[model samples]
Structures are given as structure tokens and as C-alpha cells.
Target: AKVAVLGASGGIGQPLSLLLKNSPLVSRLTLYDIAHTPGVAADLSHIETRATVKGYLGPEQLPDCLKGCDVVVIPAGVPRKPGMTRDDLFNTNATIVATLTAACAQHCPDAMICIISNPVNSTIPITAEVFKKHGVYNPNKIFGVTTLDIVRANAFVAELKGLDPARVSVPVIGGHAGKTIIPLISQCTPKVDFPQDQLSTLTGRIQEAGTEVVKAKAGAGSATLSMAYAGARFVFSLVDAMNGKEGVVECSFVKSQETDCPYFSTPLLLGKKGIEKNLGIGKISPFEEKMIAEAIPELKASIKKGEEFVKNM
Candidate 1:
């Protein structure tokens, strides 16, 4: 099936384009961006993968870029600088997301819209609203790809638990921003135990891991490289599921009634049409329950801000 990567020339976009170009599940890969897409596509065309590559730069080419796509992964918009929270980055990124999502609504309304943009809690709703405006909103098809949180949780907890990272699964729910990210430690695989102090530190680290990368980069770019890997992995899972790979499960922010909030990110079983079902938050410890409760206000505010932004526009 055809896969489209919006903003294909960016730090996150290039690597993401490369990974998608290399995916065996992708029959065709399309790259769209404001600039540099031709060079990016020209670069990927040489990869010798099974997927064919095409690039469309600027507004006039967008519809063509998205036409006939099965999965549309958007990592478009501004990259974070040092000291910027994901929400702070939103004022800029949300516009970018809105523009691209508008195109998705027109051209590939049925495609799986996986948002890799920041403030995912907000951007997911932004995408949903855009589709709604065009009369094609499908809650199940819109996803705020939050796999990096899960990837980091599994890696970090596995490092602390001496388990193989590949074998570890960490259920991170609620929102995708700092302080709003909820990692259910009680639900970790192998049923390992840890003291309260260590649990707090590990959970804090997982929640703010994006900022750690931002600070480490010293203002060069956000967590593009690692995030690209996680984004591509999420795309592969979606593509695999669409290809009839049974029971592919991953965590993503999508429209839901799982929580009081209008949108909630949770573990979902992915299939051909998008989310098969959202898994329950299930058996949270007191600390995790508190995190979810606390996240609701912030997530609701973020969702409100997004809905209002689009509504006003």
C-alpha cells in the first residue's frame, strides 16, 4: 500500500522518510514538505527498497502527494529548541498540522492519520476536527503516535530490571506531554517490583524523556533521530496489521471514551481500518491512578485549546 510522510525534509522527517522508504510493507512512499522534498525523495529513490519513492514540495503539490495513500504519517511542523515544552511548541506546530490534516481530509480521508507532531494530546484533536470539518472524521483512523513514550519506558525499565528490552512492554497512557504522561508501572511485564523512590525516579524520567533529549542536543534539534525510529516502528506495526498480521498492538493518542477527556492515548489493537479496540487502563497502582487523575485537567485544557483554536479559525 502507498504510505505518505509529510514534511519529509526535516530532521525527524528525513530519517522517517528513509525508514518508510526502506519498509518492505510499503509499496509506494510519497514525501511532501514545504522545501527540500525533491532532494529527499531523490536520496531515498536510491535506497533499492521494494517501495517506490516520490516527493512533492509546497502547497500546489500536496494533493498529489497524498492521493491514494493508505497510511499518512505526519511529523510536520516546528522542531523543539532547548527549554521548550511540547505545549510551547504547539502554537507553531498546530498550524502546520492543521494545514496538512486539511489535505488529508480532502485527498486521503480514509487513510490512517498518524500524528508525530508535538503536543500530541492537542494535535490529535486538531486532526480530528479538520476531518470533521470536511465531513470525514473517523475516530478510529486518527492517531497521535505516542510510541516513543512506550519505547523509552520499555528500554529504561528493562535496563533497570535486567530484562531484554525487546521482551518488555510498558503501558503509557493519558497524554503525551510532560507531567501528563502516565506510565503504569504495576502493569510492567515479568511482574518486577521496585521501591517507591526508584519508581518515582523511573516514572519521572520516562515522562520527561523528550526534554532530556532536547537539553542534550543543546538547541540543535529535538529528539528527531530516536523519535524517527519510534515513529517508523509504529508505522510498521500499523502497516503489518493492515497486511493481516494479526493482533498488532501499540499505544497511541486517539479519540476515546476511555477517559472523561475528549481524547485519550491508550494501548490499541491495530487492524486494517485503524484501531480495533482500546485496551483498558487496567489495575493502576495508587501513584498511577493519581497521575491519570492529575493529567485529566491538563489534557482537557490542552484539548480545549486545540478545539478552540480550530473553531476560531
Candidate 2:
């Protein structure tokens, strides 16, 4: 498949570009950034891979960068620092996402769009609004990359349960930010049990894992490597499904009527045209039910914020 990476030179984008280059699912790779991306493309282009690489520099080249792409993975935007909320990154990243997605809607409207920009609770809606204006809005094709939350849940559960992390699988629902993110430990694949106190602790950890990494880095950056791995995993599963492979399921935030909120993340069955089925949140413990309820208001506000941004634009 022809894949493109917007913001190919930023913190998450650089590492994500490397991962995509190393993936065989991609037959063609296009890299675009505001600056210093041709070197990134030239460097990865030398790697022995099935994917051929090309680079585009700035908005002037963005049209060419998006043309004929099958999958567009966007990790472009500012990184989070210590003590910052994902919402805090919204004002700046919102416009970046809007412009890039506007170009995507104009150029390759059918390409699967995977957004990794911050405030995804808003950015994904922003993307939906952009495509709607172009008369090509496909709810199934636009995804908010929330895989990192699930990835953290699995590892944290495995660590406490003394199981292999690879074998641990947990479904994280709701939105992608702090209180908005919800990990359903009761529904974990291994059917493990956590005490009330421990479950609460684990859920909070998953919600704040990004902030934990930010603090750990001490003003350096956020979770780039893990986020890249998670983003690449989502894209690969998407590509596999796009290639007609069955049973590819992954969690992502997207436009949903699953709840009162306009957008929510759920485990999705992927297919050639994008999401084939959405696996709604199943029975949850009372604690989880309460968490979901609490997340609704924040998610609604963010979703409305995104829609209003586009409406006013």
C-alpha cells in the first residue's frame, strides 16, 4: 500500500517514519514535514526494505505528498512536556491537524487517516469535519490512534499478574486523555482479577502513562518510541485488513454513536474499506461503569470544541 507520514521530522514522526519504513506492509512511503524531512527520507530510502521512499518539504509539496496514498499516518504536532495536559496542546496542534487533514481531504480522500496528534479527542473530530466539507467523510476510515493506552494497560496488568506481557490483552475504551481514558480490567483477555484498590490504581496508571513518561524524561519529551510502536501496530493491522486479511482487531478512537459522545474508542474489526465492525464496550464492573460516566462530559466538551472549530473556520 502507498503510505504517507506527515510531520516526518518531529519527535514522534521521526521514529514513526523509521518504523513504517521497516514494515513490509508499506509498498511506497512518502515523508513530509515543515523542515529537514528530505534528509529523513534519504536516510530511510537507503534501508533495505520492500518500500520505496520519497520526501516532500513544506506545504508547497504537501499536495504531491498526499496524492495516491493508501494510508496516512500523522504524528505531526508539538510534544507534551512535564505537567502538561493533552488539552493544553490543543490550540497549536489543532490548526496543524486541520491544515494537514484539509490537504488530505482534497488530495487522497479515501486514504485511511490515522491521527497521532495531541488532543486527539478533538483532532479526530477535526478530521471528520474536514472530510465532511469535501463530501468524502467516511467515519470508518478516520481513526484516532489510542493504541498506546491499550499497550500500557497490557504491560501494567502483566507486570502485576506475573504473566507474559505479550499474552496480556486489555481493552481500553472511552477517550484518549487523562480522566477520559478508561481501561476495562474486568474484561481483560486473561480474565484476571484485581482488587478494588488495585483496579483503580491500574486504571489511573493507564490514563496517565503519557504524563508519567513526560515526567520521567524531565523536560526532554513525551513517549515517542512506545507511541511509534503503538501507531505502527495500528497501521499494520489496518493494512492487513485492507489487504483482505480477516480477524484483525484493534482499538481506536473514532466517530461513534456507541455512546452519547460523538467520538469514542472501541475495539474495531478492520476490513478493506476500513472499520467493518465496532466491538462495543461489554459488561463492566461498577467501578468501570462509573469511570465511563465520568468520562462522558469531558469527551463531549472536547468533541464539541472540535466541531465548533471547524464550524467557525
Candidate 3:
């Protein structure tokens, strides 16, 4: 099956393509960006992987890149800066997301669209709205890739427990941006417990982990390498499941009836049709409930801003 990565020469896109290009499940890998992408694809084509790398540069080439793809990952748009709030990113990234999403709807309605653009809570809705206009909207088929937070949480918790990173699992819910990210420490596995202080600290760390990278980079960008790893991991699971693997699960932000809010992040069972099953909000602890409650307003605002941005378009 073919997989497409829009903005394939960017910080996240470059490495993400490298990982996906090397995956056994993907036979063709499509890369699209404004510049430097063809060379990037040519370099990765020599990586000794099964997926053939093809570059589609500029808008004229986008339709070719998208055609007959099984999965389309949108890592396009700008990265978040330290002082910028989520809304501040809305004006810039929302338009980019809407435009790209519009193209996805038109070109490949059946492709599983995984949006990695910032303000993911917003972008996912923009994608749905775009698809609805084209009569191809499928809640089960669209996802906001929030895997970075989950990967980060597992690593931090693993650090605390001194366990293998792959063996640890953490469920990070809510939105992808600040204040809205809720990492449920109580539901973490291999089922361990810690004091309230440690839980609170760890939870906060997981939520703010992106800032740690952004600050360290000192204004170049935010968490591109790690985010690429997370995005690639999510894509691999989807591609693997599509190739007949049963019961692949990953936490992603998508349209949800789990709460009053229209879109929420939760565990998704990935399969041939995109979302095989959406698991529960689970039994969130009281503290976690409060966190969810707090996230609702921002999530709603983000969703509305995204929807409104596209409505006017």
C-alpha cells in the first residue's frame, strides 16, 4: 500500500519519511513539500527499505502524490514557539490545515488522514468539515496524531520506574496543546502506583514535555525529532493493521462522543477501515476528571475557531 507525507522535507517530515520508507508494510511512499523534497526522497530511496520513495514538489504535484494512498499524514505548517498560545497558532496553521485537508478530501477520500499539524484539536475538526463538504467525512477514518505525548509519558514514567520503555504504556488524553493535555497516570501500565506528589509532578511533566524541548532548542522549533518518531510510530501501527494485523491500539485525537465536547483524545483500535474501535474515556481519577473539565472550554474554543475559520473559506 502507498503512504503519503505532506511537507515531507520539514524537520519532522524528513525523518518521518525515513522511518516509513523503511517499513515493511508500505510498498510506495509519497513525499510532498515546497522545496528540497525530491532530493530528500532520492536520499531515502537508497535506505534499503521496501517502500519506494517518490517526491512531489509544489502544489502542481500534490494530487499525484495523494492518489490511491492508504494513509496520508499532514505534518505541514509551522511549529509552536515558547511565548505563543494555541490560539496564536490558529490563524496560521488552521488555514494551512484547511487547505491541505481540502486537498485530501478531494484527492483521496478513502485515505486515513492523520493530522500532525499544531492545534490538533482544531485541525481534526477542520479536516472533518472539509470531508463533509465533499461527502467523504468519516469520523472513524480521521485522526489527530497525539502519539508524541503518549510516547513522552511512557518514557518519563519508565525513567521513574527504571523499566524498559517499550514495556511501559501511558494513556494521554485531551488535546495536544498546553493545559489541554491530560496524561492519566492512574491508568498507566504495567499497572503501578505512586504517591500523589509524584503523580502530579509526572503528569505535569508529560503535559509540558514539549516545552522542555522547545526551550532547549532556544527558538529554532519544538520537538521535531521526537514528534517525528511518535508520528512515524503511529503511522506504522496504522499501516501494519491495514495489512491484516488485528487489534492495533493507539491514542489519537478524533471526533468523540465520549464527552460533551465534539472531539476528544482517547485510545483508538486501528484496523483496515481506519478506527476499528474507540475505547472508553476510562475511569479517570478525581484529579484527572478535574483536568478534563478544565480542558473542555479550551477544547471547545479550539474546535469552534477551527470550524469558523473553514466556514468563512
Candidate 4:
């Protein structure tokens, strides 16, 4: 399968491109960006991997880059600086996502679009609206890369439980922001348990993991490495499912009817056509129920904001 990284020169894009280039699933890897892509592409091309690599620079090159892509993972747009929330990036990243997704709609409408751009609660809706404009909208084929939330939840829970992170599975539902990011700790795989106060603390920590990274980076960058790893892992699961692998389930925020919100994150059963089935939020603790209730308004606002952007455009 062919894979393209839309923001190949940026922080998340660079490392994501590297991971994809090194993967056996990708037969043709396209690295695309506004500038510096020649350097990034040329550098990755030398790696002795199963995938062949090429770089495309500027809007002029996007069509060529996307021409045969089976999956387009977009991490393009501005990265977060210190003291900024993901929603703070909506103004800049939303437009960026719109433009790029518009290109994808024209060039590769059938391609599975995995959005890694910020304010994904908005950007995913932005992507869906762009496709809708072109009459190629497929809810199954578009995804908001919310695996990082799940990844952090697993790690944090594992840390508290003293288990291998790999063995941990925490279903993070709802939107991918502060209060909207809901970690269903009660439903954790292997039935791990935590005290009430510690559970609330861990949940908060998982939701704020991106902020933790931004502050740790001290304005240099925001969660690039970890996000890249999580992004690559999600893409790999997607590719595996596309390749006829069975029982591949991962959490991603996508256009949904699971709740009142238009888009919500849930454990998606992936298949050749993308989301095979949405494993909706299950029985949860009362605390988790409150979190979901609180997240609805914020998520609805974000979804509406994205839909309105395209409507007003």
C-alpha cells in the first residue's frame, strides 16, 4: 500500500515519515511539505527499507504526491507552544487541515484519511466537511488520530498498576481535549483497580499529557516524538486491517452517532473498508459518566465550529 505524510518536514511529520519509511506495509512512501521536503525526503530515501521514498514540495506537488496513496496521514499545521491548549491551535490548524483535505478529496478521494493535525475535534469535522463538498465523504474512511490519548492512558495506568504497558488497554472515549478526553479506567483490560482519588488524578494526568510534554519541552516543541510513535502505531493497525488482518481494534475519534455529539472517539474495529464497527462506550463508573456528560457541550461546540468554517468558506 502507498502512504503519504502531508507535513513531512515538521516535528511529528519527520519522525512519522521515518517510522512509515521503515515499515514493510508501505510500498511507496510520499513525503510532502511546503518547504525543506527535498532534504527530508532525500535523507529518508537512503534508508534501506522495504518502502520506496519520494518527496513532493509545495501545493503544486501535492496532487502527484497523493495520486496513488492508499492512506494519507496528515500531521500538517502549526505545533503547540508553551501555555497553549490544542483548541488554541484551531484557528491556524483548522484552515491548514481544510486545504490539505480538499487536495486529498480531489486527488485521492478513496484514500483513508488519518488526521493528526491539532484541535482534531475540529479538524476531523473539517476533513469530513471538505470531503462532503467534493461528494466523497465516507465516515468509514476518515479518522481522527486519537491513539495518543489511549497510549498515554495505558502508560499512566500501567505505571500506577505496575504492569507492562503493552499488556494494558484503556479505552479513551469522547473528544481529544482537556475535559473532553475521557479515560474509561473502570473498563481497563485485565480489570485493574485504583483508589478513587488516585483514579481521578490518573485520569486528569492522561487528559493533560500533551500539556505535560509541551511544558517539559519548554517551548522547543510539543509532544512530537510520542505523538509520532502513537500516530505510526495507529497507521500500522489501519494498514494491517486493510491487509485482511482480523480483530484489529484501536481507538480513534471519527464521525459518529455513538453519542449526541457528531464525532466521538471509540474503539473501532478496523477492516479493509476502514471502520468495520464502532464498539461504543460501555458500562462505566458514575465518575466517568459525569465526564462524558461534561464533554458533550465542548465537543459539540468544537464540531460546530469546524462545520461552520467550511460553510462560511
Over the stretch 1-313, how does candidate 3's per-residue lDDT look in tens digits? 7899998999899988887887787899999998999899889989877888899999899999999998999999887677766667777888888878888999999999999988898888899899998888989989999999999999999989999998999899999887799998888988778899998888889888877887888889888888889998998898888887988999999899899999999998888888888896788899999999998999998899888877888
- The regions of model 2 sitting more than 4 angstroms off are none
TM-score of each: 0.98, 0.98, 0.97, 0.99
For model 2, what is the alpha-carbon lDDT of residue 299? 95
Instruction: List, residue by residue over 209-308, the lDDT tens digit for candidate 1.
Output: 8888889989898888888999999999988898889989998888889888889888899888889978868888889989988889999999988898
Q: How many clashing pairs per prediction, in order?
A: 0, 0, 0, 0
lDDT of each: 0.89, 0.92, 0.88, 0.92
Q: Rank the candidates by TM-score, best first.
A: 4, 2, 1, 3
Pairs that collide, model 2:
none
Clashing pairs in model 1, backbone N/Cα/C closer than 3 A: none
lDDT of 2 by residue, 56-148 (tens): 998899999999999999999998888888888988999999999999999999999999999999999999999999899999999999999
Full ranking by lDDT: 4, 2, 1, 3
lDDT of 4 at 276: 99
